[PDB]
Amino acid sequence: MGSDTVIDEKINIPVPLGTVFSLLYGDDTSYIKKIIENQNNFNVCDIPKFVNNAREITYTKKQTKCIVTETIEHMDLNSFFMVKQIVRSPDVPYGSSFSVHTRFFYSWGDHNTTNMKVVTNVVWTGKSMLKGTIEKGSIDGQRSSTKQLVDDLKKIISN
Amino acid sequence: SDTVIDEKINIPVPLGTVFSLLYGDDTSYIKKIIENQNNFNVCDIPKFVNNAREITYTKKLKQTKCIVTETIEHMDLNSFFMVKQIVRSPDVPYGSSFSVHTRFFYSWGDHNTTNMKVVTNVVWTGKSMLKGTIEKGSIDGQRSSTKQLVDDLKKIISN
């Protein structure tokens, strides 16, 4: 529980990265609108064009409302792009306390195709004081280590 | 949720140099980096095998044992590579119930340099039936939605 599931890492779409990007994330949102409707969703709202590498999509699942954010995390149509999707269900039990995170890896595949990997986990929020104390120590310690790592890394390369 | 530890870091050498220093088969650099962060009893660092390695050390406070799993989640030294670090501390209070997951995003920086971003989630685990039911339905649902996404993508392309 809480760990990642590799939903699938043996996906290949037989067209280049830029085509898969255009279909799923491009300026013509008709393709992704239908795809969403084919997954037993309806009343999909007008798909915003990407702005600041993000867009928010609302629809109804078969019944409950879903709010989905998609964030482009890396964008190299010659080699690799990566999108993180976060799906919220505000009206289900504890829906304000969890979301479903899915990262989509799109990487150059043999013969100019697109390899796809899909990884998901469920992220719980909700601020238990005990959890909150442990998290603050964990994040403060990682901030300290990361600053030391970057400092040492730069000293290593400078000689 | 996803706490950005650091951001907009630039290391003025190429992606491959950063990779080699932190993750290459000469593990002496990363051993020294770890030892420089108030850590001792650092094992001789294994090289990555099958995109994973395990690192054990004890940390100053008195002292507590850390078991770190690093996994290479993508590696393209011409564009982007990403390593997930999971730090477990089974000897601290609640250490069997949480772990610290940090993702290190390395991307091609201007003029053949390395840009670096670091994001942490504290993951809580622990046999909750309530959360376990939501966890399974979520992963089942994304598994269903992803298979439909891929099928629809191949139909769009083959038409």
UniProtKB/Swiss-Prot annotation, chain B:
It is found in: Mitochondrion membrane; Endoplasmic reticulum membrane. Changing residue 141 to A/T: Reduces the ability to bind sterol. Residues 2-159 form the VASt domain. It comes from the Eukaryota. Disulfide bonds: none annotated. Belongs to the YSP2 family. The VASt domains bind sterols. Involved in induction of programmed cell death in response to reactive oxygen species (ROS). May be involved in sterol transfer between intracellular membranes. This is Membrane-anchored lipid-binding protein YSP2. It comes from Saccharomyces cerevisiae (strain ATCC 204508 / S288c) (Baker's yeast). The lineage of its organism: Eukaryota, Fungi, Dikarya, Ascomycota, Saccharomycotina. The chain holds residues 1060 to 1223 of 1438 of the full protein.
